[PDB]
Each structure stands twice: as C-alpha cells, then as structure tokens.
Amino acid sequence: MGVEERRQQLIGVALDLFSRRSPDEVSIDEIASAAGISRPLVYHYFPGKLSLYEAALQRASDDLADRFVEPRQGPLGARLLRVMGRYFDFVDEHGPGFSALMRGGPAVGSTTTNALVDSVRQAAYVQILSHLDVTEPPARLELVVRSWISLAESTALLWLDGRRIPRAELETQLVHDFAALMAVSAAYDEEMGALVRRVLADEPEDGPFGDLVDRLLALSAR
C-alpha cells in the first residue's frame, strides 16, 4: 500500500488495540504485527507509542463528537435518547480503552490527550445548547449542562464495570436525569423555570416524561 494509506491503516490498527486493552498492554510490536509490517516501519510513521496513542484518540474523539449531531426535530427527549444509543454503542466498542483513559484522568493524560477529551465534552455542550436554542447560556444553565455531561461520563464508566444494568435502562435514565437536573435548578431561577417549561411543553402528553411523573406519583402513593 501507499504512504497515506499505510499511515491511516496504522492509526486504525492502533485504535483497535487501544480500544480492546489498557494502553500498558498494547505494544509497538503488537501494532506492527497486526498491521503486517516491521517494528522500525511503525516508527517511520510515529516517533513513539504516545504519538500513535494520540493519533488513535483523535480518530476516536472525532467519531464520538460526530455521533452527537442529531436533527433538531420532534420532542427533545427523543433526540437525546437517540444520541444516548450512539454514545453507548461507542462506549461498548471502545470500552476497555475508554475505562483506562477516563479512570486515568488528566494526571495520566498528556496535554494532547486531555485536550482531545475536553474537546469531546465541549462538542457535547455545543450540541445540547443548539437543541435548547440557547446562544448565551446563563450561569445556571451552563452548570446544569456541564454537570450532566459529567454525569453521563460517570454513568457509562460505571456501566462498563460489570454491565450489571442493561444499557437501554441507562440510556433512558440519563434522559430522565437531564430533565430532573434542569427541574431542580428551575426552583431557584425564573429564567431557568421558563426554559424548562418550554422544553417540557415540546414533549407529547403520552411521552416518557409523562410516564416518569406517573411512576413517581405511584411510588409516592398519593
């Protein structure tokens, strides 16, 4: 194969291995072997293991960020649920590498890896505001949204540790969590209250939010 083909092949092979195992268990020799090339030939394309890991992570990060893009049509909850399906598909596909990267955190990460992870978090933020139709988010809204993004990261990481709860339940849970976090904040702020009322007015009366409220009323045995 040609040079650019080979570079992109190598990034793919690296991404495959770094997805399957923690990065301490992936070697240049294994990457070379999977790619069908010699050890020195890998170093022709990348000067070390970290640069290849970063290149794989760039590809993965671009993939997840693109998965956040969803048409601004129909009830908002359903849009978010669709993105949550793609998000869990991604987490599944990349699980062992995702867990290793995230449970390492910014301390272990290179400046480049931390920047890539942050760029994904920011891509999520931008999409959520687009759907909310907000360009100048107030403080309270920014905190709810960013703290939900942290909640969604945590939920996926906890899911991967044993998969003791079905992903479909967690996807729906994260959608309900978003409504609930926003509703909690609405108590302290009229501007927040108005946004949440508008968002919930866009849900059908027979929708999942409806069913959540019905279930909570039932639990309360009012």
Place this chain on the structure above:
Amino acid sequence: RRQQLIGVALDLFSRRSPDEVSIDEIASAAGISRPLVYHYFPGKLSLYEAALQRASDDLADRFVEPRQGPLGARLLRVMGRYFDFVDEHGPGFSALMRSTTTNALVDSVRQAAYVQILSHLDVTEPPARLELVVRSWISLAESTALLWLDGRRIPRAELETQLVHDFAALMAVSAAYDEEMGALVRRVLADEPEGPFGDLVDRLLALS
C-alpha cells in the same frame, strides 16, 4: 518540623496552581533553607503528594455526620462542609481536578463519600442500581463544585441544596423503573415530610 512543612506546602498548593509554587517559596514560608526541605522530601512531587494526603484526610473526615434526623438535612450539613473545603482549597482543587499516587488519593476520597452515604442509607449490600446512583452523584457533586469555582456566579447555598435535591432526583429516576430501588426510596421517604423527594415530585408535576 516535617509536619509543619507539609502544612506550609498545603497552604501554598491550596492558593495557587502547583506550577506557581516552588521549593524556595515553600522553604521561605516554612522559615527553613532549601536543603532542609530536600532533607524531608526527595523532590517537589513527594511534598505535593504529602500535602494532598493531608487535604484528602481532612475532606474524608468532613464526610462523617451523625446518623440522626431527616436524611436530606444530614446531607445538606455535609454539603456545607464540602463547599467550605472546596473554597479553602479552590485554586489547588481546580488545578488538580484538571501521579498515580495522587489519583489513588482522590479515589480514596470518592470511596469515603460512598461508604458514608451507604452507612446513612443503612445498606451493606448495595444493589447495582444503588451503587451507580451513589457513585454517579458523587461525580455530579465533584463537577458542581469545580464549575462553582469558575467565577462563583451562583451562590454556594443554592448549589448545596441543589445537590441534595439532585441526590433525591437521581434516586427517584432509578426507583421509578426498578422495584427494589422503589422499595428503598419508600423505606427512605418514611422519615422525610412533604423532604427533597416530595418537592421534586411536586416540581415535575408543576413544571409539566
């Protein structure tokens, strides 16, 4: 002297990001020479880690709360101490959250919070759904405090109560679709009036 030096280092590492804290600065503040700091610590990272261990023990100890009265009030009292701590250590906390020893120390605080929450819920064998709710809330609380520190545009009193209501919310969402979680919530609502759960249910009713 070694314990005094750790305190001085924690003070400076609390006030500024660690790239802005030098051994010479620690030595001056402690009133000792640069060599005497190296006598106790091989290098800057080891002293950073010692300061973090002290801070981590302080926060974990702040999670201890008597098992008495309504649960929401217990958690609100802990949130007051948590935000006090975050305030006192703001710049250093921000910089840390943005070694494997320091990761281990941070993890040990998250675990301490977990243990205390389950203690109060009177649960020794937490179901998967409860574990995920509690751990995910701990992440939410970490995130909320870090976001608060960036500008302090929202008052801490609001975020403290917001976090208590968020715990009830995360639990409620799970309980709505899981019988075992539903039973736990009902067992746990038997001592709150109409408490964060009741107000949340009223709110979801009223905002819809």
